[PDB]
Design a protein around this ligand. Structure first.
Ligand SMILES: [Mg+2]
Ligand SMILES: [Mg+2]
Ligand SMILES: [Mg+2]
Ligand SMILES: [Mg+2]
Length: 84
RNA sequence: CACCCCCGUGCCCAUAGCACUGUGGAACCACCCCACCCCAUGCCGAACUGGGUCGUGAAACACAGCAGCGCCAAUGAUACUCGGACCGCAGGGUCCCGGAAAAGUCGGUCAGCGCGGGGGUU
């Protein structure tokens, strides 16, 4: 006549969002200590003027202007060059 | 650099790599030889290290050749597609406008640009 279940899911679950990616893009002014990429790994390597926290977070060290170096795929660098 | 060549070291990060191959030796490099100590081996001077030859340039390195491989790669067309409009009950599909791949074909390539030093041009 009717049915009695009984099944469910073992799924559903997921994890709260991890707002990643670059926050500071090609040709952008930058204050000292402004963050420029959140990333899982070495996706973007620090160049001149940019350091890297343990989160592999890239944060700029001395003001200036942001510049993206794509060195042919899998090896890429972000840097600051000050204006003048 | 005056011309070559070699040693270091860079920008470049494979159209710059690998194989096959030829050349190279006292002038730089290499193997080489010795090691009780500095120094070093999870064991061994193989490697790090130390004292120095001759000998060999065979190995390795440098340079040249080469398109077998690798890598780079068109135009043409297409896929898809912003945005204009449409058909199909629906799965799905069309037209106009611009953008426009990937894979493949044409091919292209045995790299290029520096700095310093050494050593040669009866
Ligand atoms: Mg449309
Ligand atoms: Mg069209
Ligand atoms: Mg076009
Ligand atoms: Mg060669």
């Amino acid at each position: 006549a009717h049915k009695k279940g009984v099944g469910s899911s073992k799924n559903g679950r997921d994890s709260n969002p991890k707002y990643l990616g670059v926050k500071k893009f090609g040709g952008e002014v930058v204050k000292a200590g402004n963050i420029l990429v959140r990333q899982r790994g070495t996706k973007f390597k620090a160049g001149q003027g940019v350091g890297m926290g343990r989160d592999h977070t890239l944060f700029a060290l001395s003001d200036g202007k942001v510049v993206f170096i794509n060195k042919g795929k899998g090896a890429r660098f972000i840097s600051i060059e000050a204006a003048q």
